[PDB]
Structure 1
Amino acid sequence: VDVISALKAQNAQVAAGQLGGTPPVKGQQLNASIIAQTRLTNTEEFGNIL
């Protein structure tokens, strides 16, 4: 059960929005999407799960 819980928690997707997203502050000039993808790809990352 603990292994299942850890594995479910480790991989996910984050809708991190954007810098300067709408509604923006007056005078904003940079709009960049925020990417925070803490995803695990190879075997060692899975093995490294706490």
Structure 2
Amino acid sequence: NKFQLTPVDVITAIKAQNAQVAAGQLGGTPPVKGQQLNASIIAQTRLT
């Protein structure tokens, strides 16, 4: 209450900030001709 928050906000923040995101790849398919680099993009991962 002191910060004008509720459990809804807590739940929303946990779902947004403890998240495992699929983010594709550098040089992912179908690629541009002459691409030299292919790497997974790693974005948010679950908290531990």
TM-score scaled by length of structure 2: 0.65
CA RMSD of aligned residues (A): 1.5
- Please state which structure has a larger fraction of its residues in helix: 1
Measure the CA separation in 2 of the matches of 1:7 and 1:26: 41
String of CA shifts for 1:1-32, please: whole Å, max 9, x gaps: 22122222211111111100110101111101
- After TM superposition, the structure 1 = structure 2 runs for residues 1-50 of structure 1, keeping only pairs within 5 Å, are 1-40=8-47
Identity across matched positions, percent: 95
Deviating 4+ runs (over 2 angstroms): 37-40
TM-score scaled by length of structure 1: 0.63
Q: Structure 1 stretches of 5 or more lacking a match?
A: 41-50
**Largest Rg, 1 or 2:** 2
- The count of aligned residue pairs is 40
Q: Structure 2 stretches of 5 or more lacking a match?
A: 1-7
